[PDB]
Design a protein around this ligand. Structure first.
Ligand SMILES: CN1CCc2cc(Nc3ncc(C4CC4)c(NCCCNC(=O)C4CCC4)n3)ccc2C1
Ligand SMILES: CN1CCc2cc(Nc3ncc(C4CC4)c(NCCCNC(=O)C4CCC4)n3)ccc2C1
Ligand code: NA
Lengths: 273, 269
C-alpha cells in the first residue's frame, strides 16, 4: 500500500529523514516509477504551536535552480500539512558516507568542497543563508549508480527550513510605513549572521579530515556554555594537515564573525584553486 | 451589509488599520452587538510569495492573558487567509492621541509608560520581542489618563529570543551551527527598548528623535553614525532625560537593560 501525493507516491517504510516538524520519504512518480523523488511532509499545525518559525523553503528552493541544490518539483498544501516533492539523492548524506569511509583524503575533501562552494555562491548571490549546514543535509547523488567512485558523486545541499533572506528585515521596514521606531540592529541585521554558513562548512570539513567535529559537548546547553565561556576558540588541527587546508580551517573556524574569512576569500582560497 | 466571521461580523467600510499583508476592521458580536471587536485578515498566500516570514501572532496572543496586551477571542483559518478576532481599543492608537494632544506632560508619559512597561515585562518573561513597537500599535482603551488603558497590538513581526537555541536543542547536533546563530538571543534582545525610547521622545517633543527621507536613508544614517545623541529639550526632567539617553543608544551593548528600565527612577516617581 502506497501513500499518494499528487502525481507521486511513497511507502511509509522508506523513511530517509526526520526532524521535529517534518518527515522525508523516498518515493516515485506514479506513472514514471523509475523517477525517484524525496517527499517531505511538514506538520504546519504543530509548527504553529511552537516558537520555531515556518520558514521559506518552498520559495527558496523554487528560486534556486542549481546542480548542487536539491530541486523542487511540486508542492501540495493541506490545512495542517504541506508536501514538498524534491530531488532524491540516492547516495544518502555525508554522515553516512563518513561512517563508511572514516576520514577522507584532502583530495576528496577538495572535490566535495568545490561543489559545496558552488552552492554557497548561488546562495550568496541571492542573499540567502542556510544557517543549519551539517553532514545530515549535505547529500550525495550518483547520476550513474555504476560509477560510484568519488568522481561519480554529486553533492546537493538540502533542508532549507531554517534558511533566511538577509534583506527580509529591510523589506519589512519598506512595507511597514514609518521605520523611524525600529531598532538600529533590526534595520542593519543583514550584517550579523551573513557568514554563519562559512563556520558550518568549517566544522564539516574538519569532521571529514579528523573524524569528529572540532568542538564536542554532552548536550546543546553544554556546547552553548562552551562557546560563551571561551571567546577565542582554537580548533585542534592535525599537524599533518596540508598548509592550505590548515589555513582554510583556521579562517573558517573563527568564533567571531568579524574575524572570519569573507565569502570572496573562501571562493578564492588556494585550497580550492 | 456585513461579513461574518464565526460569532462575529464586520463591515468592510470600518477599516481601522492595514499593513503589508493584513487589514483590520472594527466589528461586533452578531448577537451581543455592543461587544465591539477588532477583526484582522492576514493574506497568507501573498505573504508566502514574499521574503517576509509567517510570524507567531496567533500563538503569542493565544498564550497571553494580560490587561496591556490585546486579547484574542477567535481564529478562523481559510486556505489563503486567516482571521483573528481580537479586543477592540475604542480610543485608537497613541499616534491619534498625540494628534489631539500635540505633546504629553511628563506625568502623562509616566502613566502610559507604567502600562507599556507592564506589557514589556510579560513579553520579557516569555522571551518575546515585538520588534515593531510604534505609536500606531500602542492602543488606547477608554472606560482622562486615569480612565485610559494601554494595549500593545500587532505581533506579526514579533520573534521568540530562544527559537534558534530551541531549534538547536531539537537537532541533537547543534555542533555545526555558527556561534552567532546559537547565541543570537543576545543581539536584538533590546530592540523594544530602543523603540520605546523613540515613542517616549515623540510623546515629549512631538516628533521622532531621528528623521530621514526614506527607510534606506535612515539605515545609512545609523550605519554612518556609530553613536547617536537625541536632541533633548533642556527643560526635560533629569530622570526622563536619563531614560531617553539610555534607551536611545545606537549600540545594544550600551543600551539600558530591561531591569534598569523597569526600575528606572522616572517610573519609581
Ligand atoms: C541513512 N541515510 C539517511 C539519509 C538519507 C537520505 C537520502 N536521500 C535524500 N534525498 C533527498 C532528500 C530531500 C532534501 C530533498 C533527503 N532528505 C533527508 C535527509 C536530509 N534531511 C532532511 O531533508 C531533513 C529531515 C527533515 C528535513 N534525503 C537517501 C538515503 C538516506 C539514508
Ligand atoms: C485613525 N485610526 C487609527 C487606528 C485605530 C484603531 C482602533 N482600534 C483598534 N483596536 C484593536 C486593534 C488590534 C487588535 C487588532 C486595532 N488595530 C489597528 C491599529 C493597530 N495596527 C494593527 O493592528 C496593524 C494593521 C495591520 C495590523 N485597532 C480604533 C480607531 C482607530 C483610528
Ligand atoms: Na490569550
Amino acid at each position: 500500500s502506497m501513500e499518494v501525493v499528487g502525481d507521486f507516491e511513497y511507502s511509509k517504510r522508506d523513511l530517509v529523514g526526520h526532524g521535529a516538524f517534518a518527515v522525508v520519504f523516498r518515493g516515485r512518480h506514479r506513472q514514471k516509477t523509475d523517477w525517484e523523488v524525496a517527499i517531505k511532509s511538514i506538520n504546519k499545525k504543530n509548527l504553529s504551536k511552537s516558537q520555531i518559525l515556518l520558514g521559506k523553503e518552498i520559495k527558496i528552493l523554487k528560486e534556486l535552480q542549481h546542480e548542487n541544490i536539491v530541486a523542487l518539483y511540486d508542492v501540495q498544501e493541506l490545512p495542517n500539512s504541506v508536501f514538498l516533492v524534491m530531488e532524491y539523492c540516492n547516495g544518502g548524506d555525508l554522515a553516512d558516507y563518513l561512517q563508511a569511509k572514516g576520514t577522507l583524503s584532502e583530495d576528496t575533501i577538495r572535490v566535495f568542497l568545490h561543489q559545496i562552494a558552488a552552492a554557497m555562491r548561488i546562495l550568496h548571490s541571492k542573499g540567502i543563508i542556510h544557517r543549519d549546514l551539517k553532514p545530515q543535509n549535505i547529500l550525495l547523488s550518483y547520476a550513474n549508480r555504476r560509477k560510484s567512485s568519488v568522481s561519480g558523486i554529486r553533492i546537493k545541499i538540502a533542508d532549507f527550513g531554517f534558511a533566511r533572506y538577509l534583506h527580509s528585515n529591510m523589506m519589512a521596514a519598506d512595507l511597514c510605513g514609518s521605520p523611524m521606531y525600529m531598532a538600529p540592529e533590526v534595520i542593519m541585521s543583514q550584517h550579523y549572521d551573513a557568514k554563519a554558513d562559512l563556520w558550518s562548512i568549517g566544522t564539516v570539513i574538519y569532521q571529514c579530515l579528523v573524524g569528529k567535529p572540532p568542538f564536542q559537548a554532552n548536550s546543546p546547553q553544554d556546547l552553548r556554555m562552551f562557546y560563551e565561556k571561551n571567546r577565542s576558540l582554537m580548533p585542534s588541527i592535525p599537524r599533518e594537515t596540508s598548509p592550505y587546508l590548515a589555513n582554510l580551517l583556521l579562517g573558517l573556524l573563527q568564533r567571531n564573525q568579524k574575524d572570519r574569512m569573507d565569502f570572496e576569500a573562501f571562493f578564492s582560497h588556494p585550497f580550492l584553486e
